[PDB]
Paper text:
In general, the PriA binds to n′-pas while assisted by the auxiliary PriB, PriC, [name], to recruit the DnaB, DnaC and DnaG. In summary, the [name] binding protein [name], the N-terminal end of which is crucial for PriB binding, exists as a trimer in solution. Biochemical and structural information shows that the [name] can cooperatively bind to [name] to form rod-like nucleoprotein filaments, which indicate that the [name]-[name] complex might function as a scaffold during primosome assembly.
Although we also determined a higher resolution 1.96 Å structure, the electron density of [name] [name] was very poor.
Residue numbers in the entry:
A (entry chain D), B (entry chain B), E (entry chain E): 84 to 154
C (entry chain A): 84 to 159
D (entry chain C): 84 to 153
DNA sequence: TTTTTTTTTT
């Protein structure tokens, strides 16, 4: 929701069509994002404090889910 | 594509001879660039908003593919 | 050496003295510059169009190699 | 100190208290200038051929080290 | 403080409302001048030895800060 | 006054 680059924050959410976006970027997710996966992602990146644009954060989430679920 | 430096944009494509160029720059690609790889690259850099010449964008794409496909 | 300040051009070479020069500037290169590293460097800077003296181009190349080879130490 | 505005030259050195001067100009250097850093700075500016006063060259060195070490 | 043109000297200061003046001249400073920025400016111009009026020195300071901070 | 190339939780 902020414009420009921002640090991750507790109530951030990816777009409603995140699963479709992820597929367009080459990450096939076969299950929806869970509240726990999102919370874990956010806690990690909120602590890290690095700043990204919303679309870039969604790409990081897509990649993180792909790796997390592969294991 | 535009002349001079430009921001990345949705229907950007690398050159038809991108694979040859990438090889000349030390990146041996065995497969053509996928629709998804290109879409992901573009979304990331479009958000970033930095401006480069066409040839410089192609170099970034080559390097990104090298890393992306290595894993 | 090529004289004056010039834009990067396709046939540019850092010369035979490069590795010694790089070392004097604090960049220890163990392997010579590859054809591909050089071609990539040249294509980037030729597009950029900035103009430098030969020694200043060599410094940029040294720095670029140091960073490029740092994920490893050596040539990709 | 070298007098007047001059082009950079191979044997140039900053002052013995360069670190202190740099700090006064807002550049906190943790480690002294290395032989290699100085040589690189001199080669760049010697090629460029621009002329500056000694203090102005020291300011350029301070700024270059700040960036280089970042 | 001297009237007319003068060479830059160690104890020189710009006006208390320098930030506002700078803005009126088209230089938007986000932070006050620091003691280190001022010392650096003075050392540079003192060596140069050129002479300017007080207002002209302030303009040079504004421009120098704009460039210095843009990096 | 104006030196500084380089996309990443696992």
């Amino acid at each position: 929701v902020p414009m420009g680059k921002f640090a991750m924050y507790p109530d951030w959410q990816p777009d409603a069509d995140f699963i479709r976006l992820a597929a367009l970027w080459g990450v096939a997710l076969r299950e929806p994002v869970t509240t726990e996966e999102l919370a874990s992602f956010i806690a990690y990146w909120q602590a890290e404090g690095k700043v990204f644009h919303h679309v870039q954060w969604q790409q990081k989430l897509a990649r993180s889910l792909q790796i997390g679920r592969a294991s």
